Amino acid sequence: PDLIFCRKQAGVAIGRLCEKCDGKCVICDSYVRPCTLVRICDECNYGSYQGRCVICGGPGVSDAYYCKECTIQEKDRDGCPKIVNLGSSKTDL
Amino acid sequence: EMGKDYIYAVTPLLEDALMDRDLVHRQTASAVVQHMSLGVYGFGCEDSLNHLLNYVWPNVFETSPHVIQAVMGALEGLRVAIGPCRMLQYCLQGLFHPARKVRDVYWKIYNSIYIGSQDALIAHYPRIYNDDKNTYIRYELDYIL
Amino acid sequence: RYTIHSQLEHLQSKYIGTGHADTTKWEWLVNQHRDSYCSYMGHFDLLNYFAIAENESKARVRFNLMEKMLQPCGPPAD
Amino acid sequence: PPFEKNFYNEHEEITNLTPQQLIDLRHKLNLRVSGAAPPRPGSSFAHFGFDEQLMHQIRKSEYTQPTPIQCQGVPVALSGRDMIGIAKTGSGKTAAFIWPMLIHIMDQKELEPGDGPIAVIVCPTRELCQQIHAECKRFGKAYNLRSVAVYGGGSMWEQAKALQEGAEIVVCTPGRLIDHVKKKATNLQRVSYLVFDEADRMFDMGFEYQVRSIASHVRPDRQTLLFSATFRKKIEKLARDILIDPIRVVQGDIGEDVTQIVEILHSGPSKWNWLTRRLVEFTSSGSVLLFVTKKANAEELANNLKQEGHNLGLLHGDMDQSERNKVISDFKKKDIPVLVATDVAARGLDIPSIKTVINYDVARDIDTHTHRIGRTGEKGVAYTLLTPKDSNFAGDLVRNLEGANQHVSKELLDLAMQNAWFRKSRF
Ligand SMILES: [Zn+2]
Ligand SMILES: [Zn+2]
Ligand SMILES: [Zn+2]
């Protein structure tokens, strides 16, 4: 898998989720207790990328959250959690 | 937090499972320990979780990716539940071991404990003495009023 | 070869104060002293304590702690 | 010099047990016992046959009646057998190996000037050394035997002096014993009874190299006892290396075996007819996993099975990940009932539907053998195919089967017994 996190300084944009992966934690893939709202960086929310899914990239229909365990361990305090595809290009998958 | 009355009942099963030939047993048992320790935090089950930490630790010398990834997550949850002091006390053994493998593993564990709760470690570092050339004692903390 | 796990471990090595298997005692203890001084400057009552113990003003204690941050523990070996 | 190991005379009450009574006695003692021809356990000091001098010290103990690990371990050790005791502190295990040690020592010539110890007990810590030493001096007084403790963290020079005065028993930590031996404070030339206590703790504390060095420098026809609170692959491998046909004694609550069938065939090429006559019946029970070591052999077997009309997959180490995942998925979903794999490629095959594992080509070693047959399901069986060129492996396999209380056919035993290193060292 050629997938990393963005991990840039996140700003005031809010992450979205498509309807497949809707109630998951963007970090640990859990469904128990969504706690903290996800912020993304300004580059990952731009132009045609505005409003896409943080996890997969599809059309977003709800807000993305950190679960309670990640909030307790302070995993919301790293960079932008958008998934980046290194094996392909920008307008690719 | 409802699971705080039921850690003692489950500890023997987990002790058997964390000492087992099957790798999936140990991986899943470390997942259990992680979720227990994060679920009870600020309720006082440090005795039970210290007992379980004794059985989690021998698995840090594991070459398998998913197993070592489960063990590290259990250790990070036990950091939150138990305190960085006990984790630092377990970790100070092998930071300067002669064996480069032991040093690798222990510095991984220490770097986790350091990135999480860097400021709490100021109170838990041990006393290291001055040699001929360098001063390593912290004197302000020895001041008495 | 690009995984999330090797990206996490490389970002850990970028956090100042982190070490590896070739870290020396000198480096470890210099990190300890530097964040000890930063924490004394952050916490107000530890600084009150030191300022009463050594009969100095708080601004003077902060300036002294800042000056001691450039080379704590003396110079390195080699 | 020759020495005796077997000092045991089974009590009639124990000889007179029916097979069912024996099974129920071990259940009552909460013990699981394996190995070749284990002695029956006793249940009383009378069954151990101790004389009045030893019983005198035992009655001033701290003991009645014997503990379970003593009940089984004392007859094992008195019989001269090696032993793996999987048991926790302080289940009476220390006395379990100390009492037979005393009897063993008493049979030999007394110490001459220059003689090293007859028995050595190796410990992870000074603390345990001192406890074990205290017990050795207590019980050893029954026969006026001398014990010296040499451990790290203790005076090198006082220990050297005590060793020079002479001792039948040395209790030690591993590195410190080795140090005194190299310094010629003592020597291992009279050691015939060797105990490694808390061997798991010793490995965890970094002592495996020292433990192995000691074992390597003590005469190989010694009696050796190994105790651990846990069994893990590291200690099991150790036991294979430093014990000879041990009886394995496990306290029940600390433990928690695959059905093996071994066939001895004419030659490598005759494995094919063996397999084609049986493979359909095997697939009727569930999925079938065939192991080989070499890619070329995997390929040849798989190609022949395909030509034979079988619906099978192949898994070898040169497969890319997607290639690999397809085969494993097909096997998991039962799209293919049969899979040929090499050892190196077999990750991902802990599949419940596997009811037959076949070791078609012989495993490189017994560790690999164990890893292979672990893939089997219960209702599941692991077949191993040997030929007359596999006699060395056969010896290791016999010992593996015996430790697992599995059947050792006459044919298999005869094959193993072809080699002197097996046929003699054999208990
Ligand atoms: Zn999470
Ligand atoms: Zn971003
Ligand atoms: Zn999505």
From Swiss-Prot, chain A:
GO terms for cellular component: nuclear matrix; nuclear speck; nucleoplasm; nucleus; precatalytic spliceosome; spliceosomal complex; U12-type spliceosomal complex; U2 snRNP. Component of the 17S U2 SnRNP complex, a ribonucleoprotein complex that contains small nuclear RNA (snRNA) U2 and a number of specific proteins. Part of the SF3B subcomplex of the 17S U2 SnRNP complex. SF3B associates with the splicing subcomplex SF3A and a 12S RNA unit to form the U2 small nuclear ribonucleoproteins complex (U2 snRNP). Within the SF3B complex interacts directly with SF3B1 and SF3B3. Component of the minor spliceosome, which splices U12-type introns. Within this complex, interacts with CRIPT. Interacts (via N-terminus) with U2AF1 and SRSF5; acts to bridge the two. The keyword Ion transport does not apply. One of its GO terms (molecular function) is DNA binding. Residues 30-46 are annotated as: Interaction with SF3B1 and SF3B3. Component of the 17S U2 SnRNP complex of the spliceosome, a large ribonucleoprotein complex that removes introns from transcribed pre-mRNAs. The 17S U2 SnRNP complex (1) directly participates in early spliceosome assembly and (2) mediates recognition of the intron branch site during pre-mRNA splicing by promoting the selection of the pre-mRNA branch-site adenosine, the nucleophile for the first step of splicing. The record marks 12 as: Interaction with SF3B3. The keyword Transcription applies. The modification Phosphoserine is found at residue 89. It comes from Homo sapiens (Human). Zn(2+) 1 binds at residues 6, 41, 44, 80. Residues 74-77 are annotated as: Interaction with SF3B3. The gene is PHF5A. It comes from the Eukaryota. Belongs to the PHF5 family.
From Swiss-Prot, chain B:
Residues 89-145 are annotated as: Interaction with SF3B3 and SF3B5. It comes from the Eukaryota. Belongs to the SF3B1 family. The chain holds residues 1160 to 1304 of 1304 of the full protein. HEAT repeats lie at residues 4-42. The record marks 46 as: Interaction with SF3B3. This is Splicing factor 3B subunit 1. Component of the 17S U2 SnRNP complex, a ribonucleoprotein complex that contains small nuclear RNA (snRNA) U2 and a number of specific proteins. Part of the SF3B subcomplex of the 17S U2 SnRNP complex. SF3B associates with the splicing subcomplex SF3A and a 12S RNA unit to form the U2 small nuclear ribonucleoproteins complex (U2 snRNP). Within the SF3B complex, interacts directly (via HEAT domain) with SF3B3, SF3B5, SF3B6 and (via HEAT domain) with PHF5A. The SF3B subcomplex interacts with U2AF2. Identified in the spliceosome C complex. It is found in: Nucleus; Nucleus speckle. Signal peptide: none annotated. Phosphorylated. Phosphorylation occurs concomitantly with the splicing catalytic steps. Citrullinated by PADI4. It comes from Homo sapiens (Human). Component of the 17S U2 SnRNP complex of the spliceosome, a large ribonucleoprotein complex that removes introns from transcribed pre-mRNAs. The 17S U2 SnRNP complex (1) directly participates in early spliceosome assembly and (2) mediates recognition of the intron branch site during pre-mRNA splicing by promoting the selection of the pre-mRNA branch-site adenosine, the nucleophile for the first step of splicing.
Swiss-Prot record, chain C:
One of its GO terms (molecular function) is splicing factor binding. Transmembrane segments: none annotated. One of its GO terms (biological process) is U2-type prespliceosome assembly. It is found in: Nucleus. The keyword NAD does not apply. The modification N6-acetyllysine is found at residue 14. InterPro entries: SF3b5/RDS3-10, Splicing_factor_3B_subunit_5. It comes from the Eukaryota. Residues 12-73 are annotated as: Interaction with SF3B1 and SF3B3. The modification Phosphoserine is found at residue 6. Keywords: Acetylation, mRNA processing, mRNA splicing, Nucleus, Phosphoprotein, RNA-binding, Spliceosome. The record marks 2, 17 as: Interaction with RNA. It holds the Pfam family SF3b10. GO terms for cellular component: nucleoplasm; nucleus; precatalytic spliceosome; SAGA complex; spliceosomal complex; U12-type spliceosomal complex; U2 snRNP; U2-type precatalytic spliceosome. Component of the 17S U2 SnRNP complex of the spliceosome, a large ribonucleoprotein complex that removes introns from transcribed pre-mRNAs. The 17S U2 SnRNP complex (1) directly participates in early spliceosome assembly and (2) mediates recognition of the intron branch site during pre-mRNA splicing by promoting the selection of the pre-mRNA branch-site adenosine, the nucleophile for the first step of splicing. Belongs to the SF3B5 family. This is Splicing factor 3B subunit 5. It comes from Homo sapiens (Human). The gene is SF3B5.
UniProtKB/Swiss-Prot annotation, chain D:
Transmembrane segments: none annotated. It comes from the Eukaryota. It is found in: Cytoplasm; Nucleus. ATP binds at residues 87-94. A motif (DEAD box) lies at residues 197-200. A motif (Q motif) lies at residues 43-71. Residues 274-416 form the Helicase C-terminal domain. Residues 74-249 form the Helicase ATP-binding domain. Expressed in several cell lines (at protein level). Expressed in liver, lung, tonsil, thymus, muscle and pancreatic islets. Transient component of the SF3B subcomplex of the 17S U2 SnRNP complex. Interacts (via the C-terminus) with TP53BP2; the interaction is not inhibitied by TP53BP2 ubiquitination and is independent of p53/TP53. Belongs to the DEAD box helicase family. DDX42 subfamily. ATP-dependent RNA helicase that binds to partially double-stranded RNAs (dsRNAs) in order to unwind RNA secondary structures. Unwinding is promoted in the presence of single-strand binding proteins. Also mediates RNA duplex formation thereby displacing the single-strand RNA binding protein. ATP and ADP modulate its activity: ATP binding and hydrolysis by DDX42 triggers RNA strand separation, whereas the ADP-bound form of the protein triggers annealing of complementary RNA strands. This is ATP-dependent RNA helicase DDX42. It comes from Homo sapiens (Human). The gene is DDX42.
